[PDB]
């Protein structure tokens, strides 16, 4: 029985007692970001994506190249919440490296239409896609 999934993605700050959770942004179908070339990036915030094989959290394109295993290690570093979807498809040109997604949730209470993952840096060399998400959920109203 699959009723033991404890996929949290939440960090508590003892100072305020405030919990930074991304449970409200978590989705099974996730978010599909259209890449300017004709590739749909299927990325689920904390979980495995419906278009992806069970266990993969982010898939790049129609060939569904895994760009991150379903990880729930939400790190709160430098007032930014960061999710790293490590262990993707081994890069054919780079031995030891795999396509990974680094989502940087910048604490922006002044969040606008930027409440979506913005592809800030595309790194082909080490196969890392940097997505910046402007969310007030990385913030503590205190």
Structural domain that includes position 3: 1-142
Instruction: Determine contact, residues 100/123, Cβ cutoff 8 Å.
Output: no
Number of domains in the chain: 1
Taking Cα atoms as reference points, which of 13, 65, 75, 12 lies closest to residue 42? 65
CATH of the domain at 24: 2.70.130.10
Reported as type and span, the H/E element at residue 73 is: none
Instruction: Determine contact, residues 73/83, Cβ cutoff 8 Å.
Output: yes
> Phi first, then psi: what are they for 126, rounded to 5°?
-110, 10
> Phi first, then psi: what are they for 49, rounded to 5°?
-80, 140
Instruction: Determine contact, residues 130/102, Cβ cutoff 8 Å.
Output: yes
Distance CA 27, CA 31 (A): 8
Taking Cα atoms as reference points, which of 89, 91, 41 lies closest to residue 61? 41
Distance CA 74, CA 46 (A): 9
């Amino acid at each position: 029985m699959k009723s033991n999934e404890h996929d949290d993605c939440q960090v508590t700050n003892p100072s305020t007692g405030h919990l930074f959770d991304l449970s409200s942004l978590s989705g099974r179908a996730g978010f599909t970001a259209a890449y300017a070339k004709g590739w749909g990036v299927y990325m689920s915030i904390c979980g495995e994506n419906e278009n992806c094989p069970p266990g993969v959290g982010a898939c790049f394109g129609q060939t569904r190249i895994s760009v991150g295993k379903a990880n729930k290690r939400l790190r709160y570093v430098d007032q930014v919440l960061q999710l790293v979807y490590k262990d993707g498809s081994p890069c054919p040109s780079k031995s030891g490296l795999s396509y990974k997604s680094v989502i940087s949730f910048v604490c922006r209470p002044e969040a606008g239409p930027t409440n979506r993952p913005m592809l800030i840096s595309l790194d082909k060399q080490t196969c890392t896609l940097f997505f910046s998400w402007h969310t007030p959920l990385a913030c503590e109203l205190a």
